[PDB]
């Protein structure tokens with residue numbers, strides 16, 4: 716898979732070239748990660764990056780016992796339905 720890094724200073728997981736990313740906001744004393752925006756430029760489409768970015772964010776949340784708000788339409792409309800094994804990470808009140 717493509718190398719994804721965690722850029723805390725920009726609240727994002729991103730490709731190493733910074734061009735594709737998923738941004739988040741932390742809430743509730745660091746217990747909830749709101750995935751607010753996934754961005755893949757058109758020239759980087761077709762590489763699975765949106766999904767790889769989501770996996771990186773979900774793995775981070777899972778490892779840290781953080782729940783997720785899937786605010787981003789990619790996360791909610793595409794990633795989660797296609798990857799339902801990640802659904803338990805979603806804050807229960809979201810769904």
Ligand SMILES: [Br-]
Nearest residue numbers: 717718730731
């Ligand atoms: Br890349």
Ligand SMILES: [Br-]
Nearest residue numbers: 730731732733
């Ligand atoms: Br890259």
Ligand SMILES: [Br-]
Nearest residue numbers: 726739740741
């Ligand atoms: Br934050």
Ligand SMILES: [Br-]
Nearest residue numbers: 741742744745
């Ligand atoms: Br917080």
Ligand SMILES: [Br-]
Nearest residue numbers: 742743744746
């Ligand atoms: Br709480």
Ligand SMILES: [Br-]
Nearest residue numbers: 741744745746
């Ligand atoms: Br935090």
Ligand SMILES: [Br-]
Nearest residue numbers: 760761762763
């Ligand atoms: Br793609």
Ligand SMILES: [Br-]
Nearest residue numbers: 755763764765
């Ligand atoms: Br993509």
Ligand SMILES: [Br-]
Nearest residue numbers: 766793794797
């Ligand atoms: Br996906």
Ligand SMILES: [Br-]
Nearest residue numbers: 797798799800
């Ligand atoms: Br799955």
Ligand SMILES: [Br-]
Nearest residue numbers: 796799800802
């Ligand atoms: Br399902």
